[PDB]
Design a binder for this molecule. Structure first.
Ligand SMILES: [Zn+2]
Lengths: 52, 146, 1110, 93, 78
């Protein structure tokens, strides 16, 4: 038998010396906890976010 | 005998909050894979069903409290939630086990590491290895000892 | 006289056979014909004196009818099943992948009491599989066999136990029905009596006895003689004829409301009414003879009565009392004894017919269950048998039995002997029987009752030893399912010509003499005392006049395979078992030769096997060809026999048949006209007879290894043909349909040079491993090519097609020539699976020669792998120049206790070179017992040595001394069976003479080709991320805990870590190590195996705070 | 480096710290597209993408977006192997 | 609801004709194409569990013999 994980796997080399700029936005929840989310420089940051 | 447990809980670095669960963790999906066999036949694991049982009831209770139903139905919902969590952790430890299609108890989180199979007995202390082979042997008298 | 055209094989037999070997496939055909109520079966049953015999189907239909609606207003009945004709022939079913079956028709009748109008007509019941002429079934094209299952016979069996605390003996009785709830009566740990029903709470017998209507006075009157029964009665305190029923209700089934009527009905609801409890007509018979009840008259009611319970209680009481016999008013006197569980007076075999009957009964029970609702759902005017009868459940059950039951197994088709022994197998396993995990050591032990019924030698050597047996040669099955065996009646001390078939219990009543005992021409015993077996299964000397029966032949106790081992007496049973098992693994060779020294069974074994073709009518051959044979019978009819050529058996062997007749030859009915795979002139030929010298040779035959001459490779002496089947299916996917096309992406134009115009490999082309057999492509979907791949595409003039290559290819290590292709297409109305558009099957045939590592074996349990194949000029050779073919080591014979191979070698040498005993001054002393025809023989003269009536040692020595010379008029082997050999390498003669002769060896199916496998890297399991196992597609070897212990003992810390992390489940480490090896860099150290990460995640998910501290 | 292994007792805070997102629905995958359903089991927003360096909405499909969390569906551009390392939690009423 | 209706019609037709129906018959009865009938049948297909035993023995499990089609073949990756 053979199957699939409903996905795909590749082998492109991972790099960290050249990465996109991140403008992290921090969201505060009603319960008082705060969570940070890194978004690209394109902005369009949503006013509300579903946290962890 | 009671002092044994009391001292175990005394200055042991852990609080007694652990025996009451305010939330339960979910195992990563790839450890409970949903895969499509060759020919379109899907395959899953029982852990998914046992998890859904916990979610569904947990949702229904949230409705019953929202609707302000009398305490009988809310109490029944809480009891079923308790039973569902118990089945998720150790299916069959209390009452009859929950069974899936056919007739077989659903494997729980405790059943995949306690029984004859499971990590502690199986998939540990032995496994298959690459760069290996096997074949029939015959006598060679022209060889040296090495 | 045996077979019309049997070859003349002189026999050393000294005892004349009073009875011939019966048909070896009868155990299947007779049972199946009983099931379907064949006319010849009915005639045979009438010949025995049966009043109105009834078949299995008729019996089940009669027990089902009449179905009623619990109101008495209407009834449904079934009767007279019938079969019209078979849908298709055997070969057509086999090649079209369809079941060999016939339609079943039964006449149904419907009655309405309120009006009297009755409607009767034939109803279709379904396609029922039919037994072929050879005792097999064809299911979905494949050939299956159903084995008989040994089971505890229903009845009452008494047992004795000892309480250890008091060390006191006590007795109990258990009753087991065909269907129902079990019950037992028991004696307590100290002078008390108890009873249990349906495993429920233990209760005294007095309560049950009172609940059945026996008042205190009646109980005292009947059981006043006993001591413990009266003691318990005084100890007992329950009272009342009806109140006892409530007591039983609360003891067995407490809690539920004990209404008086419910308790009154419950006791008879599952014991005394056939609706829920039944002995299946065999338990009834067993109880009738055990207790002597209803002697001489059958009982239509197979269920329990009230008389039998009290009879069993009386039997148990008298057994506990120490009585030797007991009697019941109205019956007959019977002895009082304990019953042993393993005695064939208690075990019975249910054949294929009874298993199919049980499955049909379950299906019909489901059918009537549905009909019960359908009665109420319908109304009087619209209800009719066609609408009222639903055949789906019975058809489904029948389809389930053959395709799922453990008893129904793939036929073993290595050679005719293997298939013949498969059909005669006796299995203790299967549903309703024992289990390998629950099988104790006691049930596997040999028992005296097996003599003449189940062979003690032939049994698997694996964990299934003793659980799987083999039916004896002369054994036959009684209608009740008990194995009978024939014995010669002895009257007034002289053996009679009358033969009686006796069961084990019937045999125990008498003392049986052995056929080997000597008798005069008039049948009177010549000796004063006779060797006999007694009731207890013990051997003794008994007076001549005290014997009642004598064995039919010395072969009575052995099976078909065990009877094919010559000199069986000189081989220990342990090695005889090995020889019998290995005779069933011989592969069919390209050319077959019958054994030079045989036993005489090989003839009847082959003809009954079913792989040979025998003429059905006396006549003259019209024309002969490699494909078909035409016979012109005397009466004016013409017969045509079609021979299957190069057909593939279930185990991948060749099934080629060839004619042995020529045009213008007159043949007789039953004469063999075409040989099967492992036969020569109608005689079973599993191997080859070759020249063997017994000596150690330079250590190349060390530890059971074998040395072969290169001649056996040059002349294809041990060459075989193996045919493999490869299958590929084209079935549509969500992204589009996959199709078989000649053109496929990213392949050279030379790869598809051997593919037909429609993309299938051409017949006759040689194919290696990895070669394309069937080109196929599948839709791929999104491309998302990496930029480097797009650039490379731009460099060349190629573009990415939307299809993946998934063509069929030859597995690794496989090769040969394509000999056949079969194609099924949905476009041509073929019975393809759901979603499958096309199916292609390709057959590849390869000719395998004998090579190093192949396994050879004799008939005496002597086996070994070929370690060296020497050139002809290197082998030791006889003084006349003949080189020996095989060399066997001396050291292996003496300890293994299989000296029969030495006798076989001597007699084979005697047979190859003819012999002539001088009779100048009368017959020599050692030749007094030899028959006349054995006083001379030419070269290559085949001889027969019956298994227990074969050649004696003195005769063999004399024949060795009286062998004919060679062409040069000089003897090569002296009277000791030895000869002076010359060394092929140095040329000097060996200092001492060596034993030389001819031995028969078999080529086993443990060839190297299908066992060697290796793996550097390959597929990985998706769940456990470890290399997957199996022989196919680069499986990996397992490193168990014992190997880990050995590594730890060596102190090899690094090798163990490498084996457990790098090579098994270190996902990153595997690729990194492969990269390092290919590039030629230092191996990186391993990380964390996936197993430990999964363990940590499981622990965390189980609410455990497992953490790692540095 | 490994020195010792400790097995404590897990509280609600520990489970919430391990959790990457709460499971709200019993959904596993779409019956028609077979993609994982959001906010439920197999959710890619919580347990990670099913395809290496891709995104559920497909906007991001290159390694350069490594570490970026899509603002349209909330998936993080990371290798699909991470789906066997990410854990969720269920809040009980 | 569509699946339930298809099942009920299939049971009715099977009971009326006794033998199994055909995709053409279902298409004719339900006023949908046979391919749509096959699609509904596929949508009604329930999955199985990897935890089921396999190999005619109780030790092995079904998931033991499933290849990882997405595994990173080393020779390519290098
Ligand atoms: Zn997105």
């Amino acid at each position: 038998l053979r199957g699939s994980r409903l996905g795909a796997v590749s082998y492109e080399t991972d790099r960290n010396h050249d990465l996109a700029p991140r403008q992290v936005a921090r969201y505060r929840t009603d319960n008082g906890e705060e969570f940070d989310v890194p978004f690209a420089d394109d902005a369009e940051i949503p006013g509300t976010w579903l946290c962890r | 005998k009671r002092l044994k447990v009391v001292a175990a809980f005394q200055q042991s670095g852990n609080s007694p909050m652990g025996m009451v669960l305010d939330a339960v963790p979910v195992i990563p999906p790839e450890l409970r894979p949903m895969v499509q066999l060759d020919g379109g036949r899907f395959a899953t694991s029982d852990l998914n069903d046992l998890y859904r049982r916990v979610i569904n009831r947990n949702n229904r209770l949230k409705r019953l409290i929202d609707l302000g139903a009398p305490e009988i139905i809310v109490n029944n919902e809480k009891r079923m939630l308790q039973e569902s969590v118990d089945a998720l952790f150790d299916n069959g430890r209390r009452g009859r086990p929950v069974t899936g299609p056919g007739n077989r108890p659903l494997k729980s989180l405790s059943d995949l590491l306690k029984g004859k199979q499971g990590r502690f007995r199986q998939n540990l202390l032995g496994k298959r290895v690459d760069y290996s082979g096997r074949s029939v042997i015959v006598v060679g008298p022209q060889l040296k000892l090495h | 006289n045996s077979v019309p055209g049997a070859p003349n094989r002189v026999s050393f037999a000294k005892l004349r056979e009073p009875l011939e070997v019966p048909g070896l496939l009868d155990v299947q055909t007779d049972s199946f014909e009983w099931l379907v109520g064949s006319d010849r079966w009915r005639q045979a049953a009438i010949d025995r004196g049966e009043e109105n015999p009834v078949g299995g189907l008729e019996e089940v239909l009669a027990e089902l009818s009449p179905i009623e609606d619990f109101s008495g207003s209407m009834s449904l009945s079934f009767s007279d099943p019938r079969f019209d004709e078979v849908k298709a022939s055997v070969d057509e079913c086999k090649d079209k992948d369809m079941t060999y079956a016939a339609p079943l028709f039964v006449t149904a009748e419907f009655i309405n009491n309120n009006t009297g109008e009755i409607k009767s007509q034939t109803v279709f019941m379904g396609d029922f599989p039919m037994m072929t002429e050879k005792g097999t079934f064809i299911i979905n094209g494949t050939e299956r066999v159903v084995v008989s299952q040994l089971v505890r016979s229903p009845g009452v069996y008494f047992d004795e136990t000892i309480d250890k605390s008091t060390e006191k003996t006590l007795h109990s009785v258990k009753v087991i029905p065909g269907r129902g709830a079990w019950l037992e009566f028991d004696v307590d740990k100290r002078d008390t009596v108890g009873v249990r029903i349906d495993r429920k709470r233990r209760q005294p017998v007095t309560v049950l006895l009172k609940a059945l209507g026996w008042t205190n006075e009646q109980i005292v009157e009947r059981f006043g003689f006993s001591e413990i029964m009266m003691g318990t009665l005084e100890k007992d305190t329950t009272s009342g004829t009806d109140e006892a029923l409530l007591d039983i209700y609360r003891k067995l089934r407490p809690g539920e409301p004990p209404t008086k009527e419910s308790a009154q009905t419950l006791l008879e609801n599952l014991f005394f009414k056939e609706k829920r409890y039944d002995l299946a007509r065999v338990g009834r018979y067993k109880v009738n003879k055990k207790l002597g009840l209803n002697a001489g008259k059958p009982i239509t009611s197979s269920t329990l009565t009230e008389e039998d319970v009290v009879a069993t209680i009386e039997y148990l009481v008298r057994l506990h009392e120490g009585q030797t016999s007991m009697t019941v008013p109205g019956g007959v006197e019977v002895p009082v004894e304990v019953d042993d569980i393993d005695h064939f007076g208690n075990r019975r075999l249910r054949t294929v017919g009874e298993l199919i009957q049980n499955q049909i009964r379950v299906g019909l029970s489901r059918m009537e269950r549905v009909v019960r609702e359908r009665m109420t759902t319908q109304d009087v005017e619209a209800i009719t048998p066609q609408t009222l009868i639903n055949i789906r459940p019975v058809v489904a059950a029948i389809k389930e039995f053959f395709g799922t039951s453990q008893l129904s197994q793939f036929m073993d088709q290595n050679n005719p002997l293997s298939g013949l022994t498969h059909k005669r197998r006796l299995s203790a396993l299967g549903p309703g029987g024992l289990s390998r995990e629950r099988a104790g050591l006691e049930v596997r032990d040999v028992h005296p009752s097996h003599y003449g019924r189940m062979c003690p030698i032939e049994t698997p050597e694996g964990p299934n030893i003793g659980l799987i047996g083999s039916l004896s040669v002369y054994a036959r099955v009684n209608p009740f399912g008990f194995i009978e065996t024939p014995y010669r009646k002895v009257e007034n001390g002289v053996v009679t010509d009358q033969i009686d078939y006796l069961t084990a219990d019937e045999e125990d009543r008498h003392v049986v003499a052995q056929a080997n005992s000597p008798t005069d021409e008039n049948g009177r015993f010549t000796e004063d005392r006779v060797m006999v077996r007694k009731k207890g299964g013990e051997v003794e000397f008994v007076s001549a006049d005290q014997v009642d029966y004598m064995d039919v032949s010395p072969r009575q106790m052995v099976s078909v395979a065990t009877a094919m081992i010559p000199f069986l007496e000189h081989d220990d049973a342990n090695r005889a078992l090995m020889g019998a098992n290995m005779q069933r693994q011989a592969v069919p060779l390209v050319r077959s030769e019958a054994p030079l020294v045989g036993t005489g069974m090989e003839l009847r074994a082959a003809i009954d096997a079913g792989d040979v073709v025998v003429a059905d009518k006396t006549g003259v051959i019209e024309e002969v060809s490699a494909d078909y044979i035409t016979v012109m019978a005397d009466d004016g009819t013409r017969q045509s026999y079609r021979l299957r050529k190069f057909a593939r058996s279930n185990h991948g062997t060749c099934a080629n048949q060839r004619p042995i007749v020529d045009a213008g030859q007159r043949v007789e009915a039953g004469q063999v006209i075409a040989d099967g795979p492992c036969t020569q002139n109608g005689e079973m030929a599993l191997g080859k007879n070759l020249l063997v010298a017994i000596m150690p040779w330079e250590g190349h035959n060390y530890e059971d290894a074998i040395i072969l001459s290169n001649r056996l490779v040059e002349e294809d002496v041990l060459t075989s043909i193996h045919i493999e089947e490869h299958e590929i299916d084209a079935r549509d996917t969500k992204l589009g349909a996959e199709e078989i096309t000649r053109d496929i992406p990213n392949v050279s134009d030379e790869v598809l040079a051997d593919l037909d115009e429609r993309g299938i490999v051409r017949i006759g082309a040689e194919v290696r491993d990895g070669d394309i057999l069937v080109g196929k492509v599948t839709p791929k979907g999104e491309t998302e090519l990496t930029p480097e791949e797009r650039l490379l595409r731009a460099i060349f003039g190629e573009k990415a097609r939307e299809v993946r290559d998934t063509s069929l290819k030859v597995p690794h290590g496989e090769s040969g020539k394509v000999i056949g292709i079969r194609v099924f297409s949905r476009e041509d109305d073929d019975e393809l699976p759901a979603g499958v558009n096309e199916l292609v099957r390709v057959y590849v045939a390869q000719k395998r020669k004998i090579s190093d590592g192949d396994k050879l074996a004799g008939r005496h349990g002597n086996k070994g792998v070929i370690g060296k194949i020497l050139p002809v000029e290197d082998m030791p050779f006889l003084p006349d120049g003949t080189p020996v073919d095989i060399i066997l080591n001396t050291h292996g014979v003496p300890r293994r206790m299989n000296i029969g191979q030495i006798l076989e070698t001597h007699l084979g040498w005697v047979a190859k070179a003819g012999w002539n005993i001088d009779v100048a001054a009368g017959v020599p002393d050692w030749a007094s017992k030899l028959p006349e025809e054995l006083y001379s023989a030419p070269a290559d003269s085949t001889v027969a040595t019956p298994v227990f009536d074969g050649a004696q040692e003195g005769e063999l020595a004399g024949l060795l001394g009286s062998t004919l010379p060679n062409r040069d008029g000089e003897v090569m082997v002296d009277a000791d069976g030895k000869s002076t050999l010359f060394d092929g390498r140095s040329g000097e003669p060996f200092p001492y003479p060596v034993t030389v002769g001819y031995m028969y060896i078999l080529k086993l199916h443990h060839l190297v080709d299908d066992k060697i496998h290796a793996r550097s890297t390959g597929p990985y399991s998706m769940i456990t991320q470890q290399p997957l196992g199996g022989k196919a597609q680069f499986g990996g070897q397992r490193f168990g805990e014992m190997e880990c212990w050995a590594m730890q003992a060596y102190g090899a810390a690094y090798t163990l870590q490498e084996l457990l992390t790098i090579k098994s489940d270190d996902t990153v480490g595997r690729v990194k190590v492969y990269e390092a090896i290919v590039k030629g860099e230092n191996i990186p150290e391993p990380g964390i195996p996936e197993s430990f990460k999964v363990l940590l995640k499981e622990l965390q998910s189980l609410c455990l705070n497992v953490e790692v501290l540095s | 480096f490994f020195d010792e292994l400790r097995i404590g007792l897990a509280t609600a805070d520990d489970i919430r710290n391990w959790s990457y997102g709460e499971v709200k629905k019993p959904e596993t995958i779409n019956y028609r597209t077979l993609k994982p359903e959001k906010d439920g089991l197999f959710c890619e927003k919580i347990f990670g993408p099913t395809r290496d360096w891709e995104c559920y909405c497909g906007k991001y499909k290159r390694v350069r977006f490594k570490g970026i969390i899509c603002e349209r569906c909330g998936v993080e551009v990371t290798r699909a192997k991470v789906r066997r390392e990410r854990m969720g939690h269920i809040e009980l009423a | 609801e569509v699946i339930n209706k298809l099942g009920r019609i299939q049971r009715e037709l099977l009971q009326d004709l006794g033998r199994e129906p055909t995709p053409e018959e279902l298409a004719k009865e339900m006023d949908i194409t046979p391919e749509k009938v096959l699609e509904i049948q596929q949508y009604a297909r329930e999955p199985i569990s990897l935890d089921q035993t396999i190999g005619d023995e109780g030790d092995s499990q079904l998931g033991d013999f499933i290849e990882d089609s997405e595994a990173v073949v080393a020779v390519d990756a290098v």
